């Protein structure tokens, strides 16, 4: 039908839901109004009923509208400067002299810059070719800041296929220590090794493993990062398949794998660590079935681990309760990011300390 | 399909750093300025239409001297769905098999009867599991070297 008419119906329905008690109909109910909104938004934004209903259930009407706008809108171009090669000011000065529009992403990061437009390809700059910066997203900035690594540590990245998080870790460990970068994909492991060598990381071990096998393989890591595979509900702009290709069986399969991966990470980290016993669970999904369900599972089936403060600038507290499921009260510490609040992909981070 | 495209491109379009790399002709001219002695016939131009994908890519030394011009590159094809009888313009995702030459299918040469990967998202084809297809096989069934357009029939 007419997409302008569909949007007009969406706006009218949001207003009706805002002022249902005052502005209503003769006998039509709030359930009917929400059904009209759901059908309209599925027909306009090209979502399926299942995922659209989860997103509408998670957000209030107006905030849901903003969330869907943000999902339809491409996120900004951000570059992480390599501390192992240069620093932000010199890199920005060189890129500005080369003809690109650069400025710091904010006060939360000291090692990142935003590009407003360019005159030359940013992947073709001599600085990039020498490994002075990497094209990366703020959502991937956050997990390393949560798992700030120290020098001379042994760390395990359980899904490091792109390589940005691994290179961030090695920059903060100042090319000291050992990093175990794992990928289940060899074709993407090619690009991972390429980024590692371009950015100049000498403390890495690239392995092709299912991440559930690490307590068997080596285990005992000082710090563990788990960017779990997920639905991709926070990266809808980059992968528009999520809108119509995520249903009940998928949302049952993925969380089970996430549970097993988090349990493997917990078992692979060690308790008696002289410098850190931290596991960071991370994902780019906003769905509850993929968020804080895994954390409640972890806290309920290994009591030898506890949630700690993320030490992280921004975000909202996680959901202590939801549609019937009551969670462990500590999940308010886990923090959550949305594209419309913060112009960063929908993201979720959680920090664990082992105690036994 | 066109109305959906117009809505998206008219009211979900936002400023984004949008640039492209230089062409293989520019790269070849630069490396030739760098290399004086020109071996005779060191440049063979691919004179057939091609699909590439990215813009500023560095090719392996195996293929580094194959030059595919901008005037011959193609990005979209007129793809016909037979059962849902309709032809639409769709982007080309990859080149899967040129039945004339493995070198052609490596280079992305588009000839008659050539299997390519096409984005079929706009069609809204529902799969058996209930999902929307994001890529299908389509056979180029015209002579793109003689016709300034690429015509494909979708194998569904």
């Amino acid at each position: 039908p007419d997409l302008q008419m569909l949007r007009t119906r969406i706006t009218d329905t949001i207003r009706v839901l805002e002022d249902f008690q005052n502005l209503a109909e003769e006998g039509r109910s709030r359930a009917e109004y929400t059904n009209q909104l759901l059908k309209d938004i599925c027909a306009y934004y090209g979502y399926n009923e299942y995922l659209a209903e989860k997103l509408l259930n998670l957000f209030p009407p107006r905030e849901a509208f903003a969330f869907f706008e943000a999902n339809e809108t491409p996120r900004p171009v951000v570059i992480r400067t390599n501390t192992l090669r240069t620093h932000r000011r010199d890199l920005a000065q060189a890129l500005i002299n080369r003809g690109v529009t650069l400025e710091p992403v904010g006060k939360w990061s000291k090692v990142g810059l935003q590009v407003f437009d360019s005159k030359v390809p940013l992947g073709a700059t001599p600085e990039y070719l020498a490994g002075h910066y990497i094209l990366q997203a703020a959502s991937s900035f956050l997990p390393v800041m949560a798992l700030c690594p120290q020098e001379n540590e042994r760390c395990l990245d359980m899904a490091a296929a792109p390589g940005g998080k691994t290179t961030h870790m090695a920059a903060l460990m100042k090319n000291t220590g050992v990093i175990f970068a794992n990928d289940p994909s060899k074709s993407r492991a090619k690009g991972l090794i390429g980024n590692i060598h371009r950015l100049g990381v000498r403390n890495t071990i690239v392995c092709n493993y299912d991440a559930r096998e690490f307590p068997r393989v080596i285990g005992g890591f000082d710090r563990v990062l788990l960017d779990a595979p997920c639905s991709g509900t926070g990266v809808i702009c980059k992968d528009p398949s999520v809108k119509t290709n995520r249903d009940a069986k998928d949302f049952m399969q993925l969380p089970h794998t996430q549970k097993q991966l988090l349990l493997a990470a917990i078992d692979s980290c060690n308790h008696a660590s002289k410098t850190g016993g931290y596991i960071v669970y991370s994902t780019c999904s906003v769905c509850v079935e993929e968020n804080e369900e895994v954390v409640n599972y972890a806290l309920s089936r290994r009591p030898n681990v506890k949630l700690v403060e993320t030490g992280l600038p921004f975000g909202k507290e996680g959901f202590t309760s939801y549609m019937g499921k009551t969670f462990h009260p500590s999940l308010k510490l886990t923090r959550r990011f949305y594209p419309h609040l913060y112009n960063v992909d929908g993201f979720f981070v959680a920090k664990f300390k082992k105690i036994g | 399909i066109k109305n959906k495209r117009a809505e998206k491109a008219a009211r979900f379009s936002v400023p984004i750093p949008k640039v492209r790399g230089i062409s293989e002709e520019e790269m070849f001219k630069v490396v030739k300025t760098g290399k004086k002695t020109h071996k005779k016939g060191w440049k063979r131009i691919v004179t057939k239409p091609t699909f590439v994908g990215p813009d500023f890519t560095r090719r392996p030394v195996k293929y580094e001297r194959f030059i595919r011009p901008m005037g011959l590159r193609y990005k979209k094809a007129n793809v016909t769905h037979p059962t849902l009888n309709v032809t639409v313009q769709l982007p080309i995702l990859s080149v899967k098999k040129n039945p004339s030459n493995p070198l052609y299918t490596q280079l992305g040469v588009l000839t008659k009867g050539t299997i390519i990967e096409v984005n079929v998202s706009d069609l809204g084809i529902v799969t058996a599991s209930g999902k929307i297809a994001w890529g299908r096989y389509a056979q180029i069934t015209n002579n793109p070297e003689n016709d300034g357009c690429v015509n494909a029939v979708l194998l569904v």
Partner: peptide, 14 residues
């Protein structure tokens, strides 16, 4: 309006 005024990444300079 759902935009943290301190650290929301803008699309345009400054």
């Amino acid at each position: 309006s759902f935009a943290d005024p301190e650290v929301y990444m803008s699309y345009t300079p400054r």
